[PDB]
Amino acid sequence: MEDENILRNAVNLQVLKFHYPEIESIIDIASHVAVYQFDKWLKTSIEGTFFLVKDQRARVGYVILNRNSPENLYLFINHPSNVHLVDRYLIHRTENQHVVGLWMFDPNDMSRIFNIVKESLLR
Amino acid sequence: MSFTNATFSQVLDDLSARFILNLPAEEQSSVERLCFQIEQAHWFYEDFIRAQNDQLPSLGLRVFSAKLFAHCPLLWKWSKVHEEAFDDFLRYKTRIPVRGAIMLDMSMQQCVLVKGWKASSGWGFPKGKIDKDESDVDCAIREVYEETGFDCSSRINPNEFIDMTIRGQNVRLYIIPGISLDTRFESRTRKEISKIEWHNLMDLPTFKKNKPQTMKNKFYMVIPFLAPLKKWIKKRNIANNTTKEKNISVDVDADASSQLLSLLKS
Numbered sequence: 001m002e003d004e005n006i007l008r009n010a011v012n013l014q015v016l017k018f019h020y021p022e023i024e025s026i027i028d029i030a031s032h033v034a035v036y037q038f039d040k041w042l043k044t045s046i047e048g049t050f051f052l053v054k055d056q057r058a059r060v061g062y063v064i065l066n067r068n069s070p071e072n073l074y075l076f077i078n079h080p081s082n083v084h085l086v087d088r089y090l091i092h093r094t095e096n097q098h099v100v101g102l103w104m105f106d107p108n109d110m111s112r113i114f115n116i117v118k119e120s121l122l123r
Numbered sequence: 124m125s126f127t128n129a130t131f132s133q134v135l136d137d138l139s140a141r142f143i144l145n146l147p148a149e150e151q152s153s154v155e156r157l158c159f160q161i162e163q164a165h166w167f168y169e170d171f172i173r174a175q176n177d178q179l180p181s182l183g184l185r186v187f188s189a190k191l192f193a194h195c196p197l198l199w200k201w202s203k204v205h206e207e208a209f210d211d212f213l214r215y216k217t218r219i220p221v222r223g224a225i226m227l228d229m230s231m232q233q234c235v236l237v238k239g240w241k242a243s244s245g246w247g248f249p250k251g252k253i254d255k256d257e258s259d260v261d262c263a264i265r266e267v268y269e270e271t272g273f274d275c276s277s278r279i280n281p282n283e284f285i286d287m288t289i290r291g292q293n294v295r296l297y298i299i300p301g302i303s304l305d306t307r308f309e310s311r312t313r314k315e316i317s318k319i320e321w322h323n324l325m326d327l328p329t330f331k332k333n334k335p336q337t338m339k340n341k342f343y344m345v346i347p348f349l350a351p352l353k354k355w356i357k358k359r360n361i362a363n364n365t366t367k368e369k370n371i372s373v374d375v376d377a378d379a380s381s382q383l384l385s386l387l388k389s
């Protein structure tokens with residue numbers, strides 16, 4: 001039954017808005033993402049459930065609700081050109097000109113998010 | 124300190140959204156694959172959340188899991204035969220055993236804790252895995268000795284301990300009161316350890332009713348044993364003025380746990 005999904009969406013959105021009240025919409029979700037940084041890839045402490053979110057001012061971004069500690073990550077994707085698929089990472093060029101590497105344990109999540117990201121910052 | 128003002132209900136949603144809610148359907152249907160994530164949540168709860176909100180109750184896995192189901196819609200479509208088999212599995216999952224001790228002073232208000240170097244390592248009770256054919260008591264004696272330099276074979280009591288399943292391990296910490304308050308600790312066989320110190324129980328994150336935690340200490344699997352400990356001491360004090368120790372143990376995942384499950388589940 002579809003009821004469970006309507007229910008699953010509402011919980012998700014509550015959980016995120018509780019952490020970040022500006023968030024208005026969830027675009028898509030990957031169950032398990034690991035975060036890597038540069039300087040060559042280095043492993044971070046942040047690893048958990050990935051949510052592709054849209055801001056109230058319509059800013060696309062993502063939340064990882066970290067599994068290892070209550071220290072979550074939340075970054076904006078300002079422009080489509082700030083993202084790339086290399087080496088099975090979804091690579092993201094932050095405002096702070098850091099290079100982030102997102103590892104979707106599910107390759108399918110990788111492709112689906114990348115694509116919807118491009119579409120969501122297109123319109 | 125995100126969860127300091129969250130209700131129990133909001134905390135339950137988070138842990139759900141965080142660990143189990145957004146799993147692929149097949150993983151939710153896998154007792155093992157789901158039990159793992161729930162084991163992670165229960166620990167995240169005891170170790171991180173309760174630390175900023177002591178109002179939140181300390182729960183054994185089995186109970187915590189039940190309440191985590193209430194905040195997970197995709198699990199509501201399933202049989203009583205199914206949910207009972209799962210709980211069964213939570214009760215008897217083959218888990219790595221870990222033994223050690225909670226070393227207390229004579230006055231039972233201070234305990235011995237061990238810290239790695241790394242800033243990512245929080246203080247913890249002396250504990251470790253079991254060597255082949257080694258006995259529970261014998262493993263505890265060994266871990267304490269290696270980590271602490273203190274030989275406890277003369278004071279360890281096979282009848283006095285706390286059992287608890289936390290983060291996918293079956294922890295047993297023997298409770299050894301009356302440790303000399305100027306014991307000198309050593310860790311020469313354990314090069315990883317940098318500090319080994321007496322801490323006041325009253326300074327431990329959830330120990331005293333409404334003492335807030337200062338952000339100046341990190342603790343590993345300490346907080347979860349504090350509820351069973353308060354209970355141990357209460358009881359050991361009753362015994363001290365009535366008979367003689369020996370009997371006093373506290374099994375978190377046993378009766379106390381099934382009593383509470385019946386109250387929820389009935």
Ligand SMILES: Nc1ncnc2c1ncn2[C@@H]1O[C@H](COP(=O)(O)OP(=O)(O)OP(=O)(O)O)[C@@H](O)[C@H]1O
Nearest residue numbers: 219221239243244245246247250251252342343344
């Ligand atoms: N003292 C500690 N402080 C913080 N995190 C810890 C500590 N001990 C273990 N962990 C965490 O627990 C996870 C798994 O435990 P880990 O393998 O590090 O312990 P271990 O010493 O191998 O356990 P065992 O005693 O069973 O061998 C790791 O991700 C690690 O971050």
